[PDB]
């Protein structure tokens, strides 16, 4: 999914 969140968690 390209629209998945791109940031650290």
């Amino acid at each position: 999914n390209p629209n998945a969140n791109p940031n650290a968690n």
Partner: antibody
Amino acid sequence: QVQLVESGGGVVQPGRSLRLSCAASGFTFSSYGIHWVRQAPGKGLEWVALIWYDGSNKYYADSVKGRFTISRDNSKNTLYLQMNSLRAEDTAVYYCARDGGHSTSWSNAFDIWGQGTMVTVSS
Amino acid sequence: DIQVTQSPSTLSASVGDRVTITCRASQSISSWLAWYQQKPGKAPKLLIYKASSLESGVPSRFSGSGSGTEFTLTISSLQPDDFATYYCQQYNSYWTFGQGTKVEIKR
């Protein structure tokens, strides 16, 4: 203060290569996914590519796939866009833009933008 | 591919006027729509995210509405620095922006 600074733009001949970069300061760069977005003279905004915070997942627009490569060096707080086989229609201001991080369960609108770097593809 | 089209392409208005601009997605984007303001030769500025959420520090005269395929951006009363081009962007399937609505000074 949070800031994104693009560099590398200049006159480059068609068919040649150019490596843009985007240097971040004022925030934890290694925590954020970052996009490249471009705007051709007189035209609208066109998303180019996304890289994840750790440089793992990379997404490209169909117009640049196979010619452009996104990468990052978190130790230098820097993002790159290697452009190969440049065409005249790649002439544009190139922006780096941060995922806003409003929500952790989806990607977000682009909150922080750089000033842009102008790439002119001409012989 | 999801397309987003804005209407109108140019809007003429005066300071103090209210302006509502529209953005239509070719298929449902749920609430994943953002509004940006761009002045000529300047970096875009985020105004609204998730259809109606106001980005921090953006003046309260900007409001967004809509879901699914029909969305709108309203400026309650235009200020002199609001003359600009406005772009909507869907972040549901990849990233696509609209063609922009130029808000221009009427005379």
